[PDB]
């Protein structure tokens, strides 16, 4: 293979390939994460090009283990690589410690792999930014990991197309004390701010995490949330 780095420092001190990877993220379909008092919501725009697409065939909101979940903005195929790696990393921890991996621990391990693709030879950084949610030590967690390999713990945040507006909308719209039932509603309203068209239970995707672990909401559950919107 190519043994030299493909991401290098420009004369101004910037790692330009990482900057260009972040541009891929900023042009992807929007995603939202909201840390409620008793849980976590993950919401995304799953709008495909035509009726011909079997919406039910592939997912954006994915499980990692029983208590961790995931969503992204950017390059779809890149995301799948990180999903497999994350699921594998979560099993390695469980095999050794016999305890569900802490969300900070999963996010750190995954973020290390992302950093690797910014320095290892003959590879480009991932064109993806991941929103990771979990439940451990009786409390909810919401993290974000970006193409540089940097991670951030959020209370609520937006990624992809119109993230600047969604992030201001989340800040003013809601704050701490949110019930998970209230947080799901807010995540769908944040998405409605960018969405072009009628928002149905087949073009949006939601996942929740609480005491009972992480799971993806069914289209019938999303439909009842959309009945109030």
């Amino acid at each position: 293979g190519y043994s030299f780095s493909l991401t290098t420092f420009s004369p101004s001190g910037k790692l330009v390939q990482i900057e260009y990877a972040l541009a891929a993220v900023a042009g992807g379909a929007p995603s939202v994460g909201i840390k409620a008092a008793n849980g976590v919501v993950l919401a995304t725009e799953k709008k495909q090009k035509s009726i011909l697409y079997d919406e039910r065939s592939v997912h954006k909101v994915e499980p990692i283990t029983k208590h961790i979940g995931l969503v992204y903005s950017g390059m779809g195929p890149d995301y799948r690589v990180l999903v497999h790696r994350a699921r594998k990393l979560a099993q390695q921890y469980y095999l050794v410690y016999q305890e569900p991996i802490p969300t900070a621990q999963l996010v750190q391990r995954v973020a290390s792999v992302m950093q690797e693709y910014t320095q290892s030879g003959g590879v480009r950084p991932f064109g993806v930014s991941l929103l990771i949610c979990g439940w451990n030590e009786g409390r909810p967690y919401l993290f974000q990991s970006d193409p540089s390999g940097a991670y951030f713990a959020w209370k609520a945040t937006a990624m992809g197309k119109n993230y600047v507006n969604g992030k201001t909308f989340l800040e003013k719209r809601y704050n701490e004390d949110l019930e998970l039932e209230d947080a799901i509603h807010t995540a769908i309203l944040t998405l409605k701010e960018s969405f072009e068209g009628q928002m149905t239970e087949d073009n949006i995707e939601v996942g929740i995490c609480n005491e009972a672990g992480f799971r993806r909401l069914t289209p019938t559950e999303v439909k009842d949330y959309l009945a109030a919107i």
Binding site: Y2, S148, A153, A156
Partner: protein, 241 residues
């Protein structure tokens, strides 16, 4: 293949290693991070760049990393690169402890990482780590110590130093107010805030940590926001008077 090679480990016509020099530029854009040595301890005071209202603040720090029982560090540069280096620092400290059954002496831990950083400048064809570190510690040979290392793998011991944004201005400001040998953690903490105020002031935008010796055991502690608030208003009062 030759076409796409960046040539990251080669000398320029004036004997300069350009990737190393461009790595340092990255550190100038990172948040200001200063270290001050005192007789009764040693401190780390860094600017917080994760300063948004919707941040969770799960961890005990942002830039301050415990490495050893007797050592801690702060970073300025690419944070993901800094995660690699701090994790390696923790492994070097445990390899020493396993072998000698004594904690790694401060300067030795810094040299070991600097030998990895130097290797990135001489071979492999990879870009360097875009990080500068400030290390604080205690050992049975030289007591309270303060180090600094840059992407080149070069390091040095200091009585006060600064890296990150406006590092130059902070070192000239520390140069004037630093009283060698007559410094205590109380006066040095006052100086840390005095400097960060000019080089940047809520307790949300700052992050301080101290290393002290209590009952023959080292005590590393990141100060609480209220503690930092009391230190900022004790300076805000002196500035008005």
């Amino acid at each position: 293949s030759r076409r796409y090679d960046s040539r990251t480990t080669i000398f320029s016509p004036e004997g300069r290693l350009y990737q190393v020099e461009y790595a340092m530029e990255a550190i100038g854009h990172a948040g200001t991070c200063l270290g001050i040595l005192a007789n009764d301890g040693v401190l780390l005071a860094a600017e917080r760049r994760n300063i948004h209202k919707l941040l969770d603040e799960v961890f005990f720090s942002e830039k301050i990393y415990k490495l050893n029982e007797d050592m801690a560090c702060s970073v300025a540069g690419i944070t993901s690169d800094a995660n690699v280096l701090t994790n390696e620092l923790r492994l070097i400290a445990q390899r020493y402890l396993l072998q000698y059954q004594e904690p790694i002496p401060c300067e030795q831990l810094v040299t070991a990482l600097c030998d990895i950083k130097q290797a990135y400048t001489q071979f492999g064809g990879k870009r360097p780590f875009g990080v500068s570190l400030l290390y604080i510690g205690w050992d049975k040979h030289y007591g309270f110590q303060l180090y600094q290392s840059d992407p080149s793998g070069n390091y040095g011991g200091w009585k006060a130093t600064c890296i990150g944004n406006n590092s130059a201005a902070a070192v000239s400001m520390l140069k004037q107010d630093y009283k060698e040998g007559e410094m205590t953690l109380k006066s040095a903490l006052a100086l840390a805030i005095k400097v960060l105020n000019k080089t940047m002031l809520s307790a949300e935008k700052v992050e301080i940590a101290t290393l002290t010796r209590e009952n023959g055991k080292t005590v590393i502690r990141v100060l609480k926001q209220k503690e930092v608030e009391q230190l900022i208003k004790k300076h805000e009062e002196e500035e008005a008077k």
